[PDB]
Amino acid sequence: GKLNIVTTFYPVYEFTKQVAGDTANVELLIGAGTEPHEYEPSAKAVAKIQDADTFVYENENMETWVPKLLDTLDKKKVKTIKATGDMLLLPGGHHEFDPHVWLSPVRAIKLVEHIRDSLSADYPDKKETFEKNAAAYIEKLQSLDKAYAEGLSQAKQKSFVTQHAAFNYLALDYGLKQVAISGLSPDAEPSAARLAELTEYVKKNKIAYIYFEENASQALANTLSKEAGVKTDVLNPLESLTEEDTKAGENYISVMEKNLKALKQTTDQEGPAIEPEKAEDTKTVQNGYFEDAAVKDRTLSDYAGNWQSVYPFLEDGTFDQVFDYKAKLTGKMTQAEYKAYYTKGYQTDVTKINITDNTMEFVQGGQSKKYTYKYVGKKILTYKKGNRGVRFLFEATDADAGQFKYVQFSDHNIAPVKAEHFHIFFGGTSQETLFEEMDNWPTYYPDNLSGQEIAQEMLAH
Ligand SMILES: [Cl-]
Ligand SMILES: [Zn+2]
Ligand SMILES: [Zn+2]
């Protein structure tokens, strides 16, 4: 009969139904009346998932209860699908990363593609149906992407204030700037103190709208207008669709069309950029802001382990999303320019480095050269930005060390601690010549990681 597919919340349900069509009965586990971020599965819910043919969830950074279920699910017959597939995430403002990729139409295409791919692998006899259904829905998503680009590319004012911070990927992919606001709910009146803070914030930044995940209550809208001097509207994160909206034919695409209209009320109006209510402090040791007194000698054992070059994962495309993000975050280089920059940086024929308390072993061409190393000191460099970094210096004790005679590690630390990754400068001339090297910095992560894991780790912090 039809596949019994259990999905978690609304966009996972919709995207899965679009791909599976009449091959499946697709169930929505989290009903519209429950906020998906707050959902916790009951024993009955877990049973329903365990007994399904296929279970689809969006991402462990959204359905934070899914990781604990997978250890047992992996032993049951149900085939699981993580909708985001190999999509890399950025940190949010428990879970490490912001899951809200489906509010970017171009990313929604990638989730639909991945659901197609996984269902096609899981049920090969239906692959032509999945592929056909997916392609037709992707056509509609492509038109949505075009509407987004056309409606946002000429934005005069790129920043928008949202009570639900679901729109950072939309912002990155279409040239806007999400400004999340805290301590607000569509159905609740703020405290006197919070309202005063909001009134000052609106005035300081000339904020025209506060956007909410659903319509603000009549009372809250009135209060924000008469006391805080700001209008309200809806930026719907498409996490829930009411039965009323379902029966009126609303869906992901129509919600996103409404979101575009709502955004443009802000983005097509002149005005100053809106600052976050509380400012960031990026001046940290790992970002290169530290005091001389905290810089300490280190031993080779901080770097002990087995380490793999990241260069093959640039070459094979695994890091293409990293360079896409960098371009969208800074605007300073294009994606291709960033990839070229990191090609020069990562290029090396040293595929692996094994490090002990006293030795380093360098693998080139499937053969290894191993030397004993002594610590020789450290060097604090200052960069254009005004931040600094510490190189920790080692020298091989073998006459035959060649290009590995001199070795310097950079790992964003300044004192004893186990490295999580490093950039390594090595040569056979002197330490001083390596201090001037700024273009090539072969980069290593633990051998126990996949390239995909390295790529996601690069975006963390
Ligand atoms: Cl780095
Ligand atoms: Zn959300
Ligand atoms: Zn680094």
Author numbering: 27 to 119, 134 to 501
Give the exact sentences the study uses for this entry:
Although both SBPs share this structural core, AdcA also has a C-terminal domain (residues 322 to 501; here termed AdcAC) that is structurally related to ZinT, a periplasmic protein from E. coli and Salmonella. The AdcAC domain is linked to the N-terminal cluster A-I domain of AdcA (residues 1 to 311, henceforth referred to as AdcAN) by an 11-amino-acid linking region.
The high-resolution crystal structure of wild-type, Zn2+-bound AdcA was determined at 1.58-Å resolution and revealed a two-domain organization with the AdcAN and AdcAC domains forming discrete globular regions, connected by an 11-amino-acid linker and each containing one Zn2+ ion. These four residues bind a single Zn2+ ion via 4-coordinate geometry, with bond distances of 1.98 to 2.08 Å. The partial opening of the Zn2+-binding site of the AdcAN domain arises from the α7β6 loop having moved away from the binding site due to rigid-body rotational movements of α7 in a plane perpendicular to the helical hinge interlobe helix α5. In Zn2+-bound AdcA, interaction between the domains occurs between α12 and α15 of the AdcAC domain and α7 and the base portion of the His-rich loop (residues 109 to 117) of the AdcAN domain, with a buried surface area of ∼1,200 Å2. Our structural and computational data reveal that the AdcAN domain and the AdcAC domain form a stable interaction, with the His-rich loop positioned at the interface between the two domains.
